[PDB]
Amino acid sequence: PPGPPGPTGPRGPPGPPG
Amino acid sequence: PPGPPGPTGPRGPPGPPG
Amino acid sequence: PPGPPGPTGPRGPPGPPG
């Protein structure tokens, strides 16, 4: 069978400062 | 065969205070 | 046997403004 989905990608960067 | 690529990661955290 | 996990996914999008 095909392998599992790869690891989920890393979390995105923080938003811009307020 | 290889599994599919992992999904796109979660959105980043809110930005820092200004 | 089963294939290997896929590649790690793309980085997530940036967070919302602080």
DSSP string, A1-18: -PPPPPPPPPPPPP----
Place of tokens 């896929």: C6
Contacts of A4 in chain C (CB under 8 A): 2, 5-6
Question: How far is the CA of B8 from the CAs of A8, A9, A17, in angstroms?
Answer: 6, 5, 23
The method of structure determination was X-ray
Q: Do A4 and C7 touch (CB under 8 A)?
A: no
Instruction: Specify whether the CB–CB gap between C13 and B10 falls below 8 A.
Output: no
Q: Do B6 and C4 touch (CB under 8 A)?
A: no
Instruction: Specify whether the CB–CB gap between C7 and B7 falls below 8 A.
Output: no
Question: How far is the CA of C1 from the CAs of A1, B1, C5, in angstroms?
Answer: 7, 10, 12
